[PDB]
Design a protein around this ligand. Sequence first.
Ligand SMILES: Nc1ncnc2c1ncn2[C@@H]1O[C@H](CSCC[C@H](N)C(=O)O)[C@@H](O)[C@H]1O
Length: 233
Amino acid sequence: RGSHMMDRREIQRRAKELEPWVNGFEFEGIRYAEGSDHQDPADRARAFYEAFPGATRILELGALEGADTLALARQPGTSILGLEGREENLRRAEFVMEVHGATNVELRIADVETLDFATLGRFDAVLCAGLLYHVREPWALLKDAARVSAGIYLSTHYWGSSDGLETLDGYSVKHVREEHPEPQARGLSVDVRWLDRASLFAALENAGFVEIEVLHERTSAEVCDIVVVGRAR
Ligand SMILES: Nc1ncnc2c1ncn2[C@@H]1O[C@H](CSCC[C@H](N)C(=O)O)[C@@H](O)[C@H]1O
């Protein structure tokens, strides 16, 4: 066993100490931990780098257990900063990076609703998946991405109706208590706001992402799903 490898005994001990996992943990064909009741990272990374082939410095928001972070880091020559709001999730992600020897990744605790994004430097693109519907002011998160980058890969839900919605900063919003079924995926505020489709596209435009490419969309009168690439000047 190469000197760069963590001992399997220690992989086992630490993976157990880190339970419960959200997406589980497997390494060398050994399933150490199972995930919870609630895209494949390699496929997401492929789509991300189809959109941003020249990217060498990436910001990932809401890194969870580091699965996308690791997939994005496979290519040498690209460095990733992953931000995660829940310390318990971050500790998992840090363990994953250590087990895999992913030295081109940095992980940091951060609350995207309060962080000063101007402290982070510049990125070729921002990955923002599974996060926009966990914040109070989603338009502001999009503005923060634009402060540091000209590209965003955004995967989010939006709300399929405009009827009866509230209005904040001119956007139509569904304002609800944060009750996402996976507790370890929840936002850091008691509440969240979802956007209707028009307000999501307006918020992208108003942040500066004036060119929007839709990669995937599933519509309903209620929960909708979308993946878009936003590009700013
Ligand atoms: N305000 C906030 N600041 C930073 N991270 C947050 C946050 N609100 C939620 N998160 C984190 O964002 C993640 C949401 S689940 C999405 C995980 C991953 N991006 C994916 O697409 O599969 C969780 O790890 C959660 O703890």
